[PDB]
Ligand binder design. Structure first.
Ligand SMILES: O=C1c2ccccc2C(=O)c2c(O)c(O)cc(O)c21
Lengths: 115, 115, 115, 115
């Protein structure tokens, strides 16, 4: 599991459950090609997006559908989605955890890169 | 100033100066059209991006070029840029301040929306 | 204004108005002596807490009463308050802006230090 | 394990390892009584601070020694420590995770409260 995404809800102090997200890889034409997708579990985590062999160096975008999450809770959010755009690099550590902390008008995202 | 962006550097405890950013607006064909661009001042603020007349309702993307900022400082960061995507002026004209707080492996973005 | 505090509300996307805060300075006996206090304005800012002459070197604690803020709004938050503790003016006089971004279960605080 | 603390480093994009912290419980005299302490592991987590029977309702303070963490890395931080002050409440979910995201001039803290 080279890539895992964890989403937290700062209003309720909980994992953000059933949050959909799509991962894209930047192609040579500079368009975003679909790569992987899924929805967070009861723990707010999405595991199994990709494999080591598949996740090669390149630029990736994780598009988290935060608007649908907030609307399902009856809250009107600011952002259309949360976007995390980054280069995967073999010179560094092996495993990427992308964390996203969600509020209606704010979000933060953090990368924890380990071996 | 219907749209203003302020950027802070969490490593130095300072405004983030000379941060470039590009604003796009979603066209009717669902492509991102260039809207405005600029760089932050010594206060870390970018004013004057647009006018009330030109900033119509739509979906806007503010791409803050954080990697270029960190690389100019000799730091290799995680993200390519920060991408703030939002619907603007759907209730009528509003004033938007987008704040961004930058660290090499993490950032947060917040919107202050006033009438 | 050697010390200023700005507070934002990540749920409403607005300045956090009427947030009370109490500033303390560590005395020679290692107890927290009351230093200054105030509340944020409609802009979410608190100015005029102290003067250059009175804000000497020391360890300061800014206690932002976030629970009182959220409870006045009918939200039960996690934290009692946010506590920002720092050494000030150890290199000579500086200007400090303490920013705080509030959600019910999360907050961040950042310092901008200028000479 | 009713209480767990996780600390992340936003400069290196890593768990913050060997971060010391002390937990205090507010006594009836309104003084902070030592409760538990430890240091984060290689995963940035501190487990086993307390037990269900011991962690009764009341106000607790987690004081994370962030200054020593940054100084050990050769970086001059703003804050003396990070402070998380909160009420433990039996009316809510059973397990508390306190997360802290550290930068030299900024930190965020989040509570994830689950069953
Ligand atoms: O709460 C957070 C959290 C809060 C604000 C920013 C980042 C994180 C974060 O990265 C994070 C993790 O990586 C994690 O593994 C468990 C967490 O609870 C968090």
């Amino acid at each position: 599991c080279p890539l895992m995404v964890k989403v937290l809800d700062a209003v309720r102090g909980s994992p953000a459950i059933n949050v959909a997200m799509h991962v894209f890889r930047k192609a040579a034409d500079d368009t975003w090609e679909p790569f992987a997708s899924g929805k967070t579990s009861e723990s707010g985590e999405l595991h199994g997006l990709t494999t080591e062999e598949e996740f090669v160096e390149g630029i990736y975008k994780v598009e988290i559908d935060t608007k649908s999450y907030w609307k399902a809770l009856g809250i009107s959010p600011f952002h259309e989605h949360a976007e995390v755009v980054f280069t995967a690099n073999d010179s560094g550590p092996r495993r990427y955890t992308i964390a996203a902390l969600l509020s209606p008008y704010s979000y933060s995202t953090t990368a924890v890169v380990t071996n």
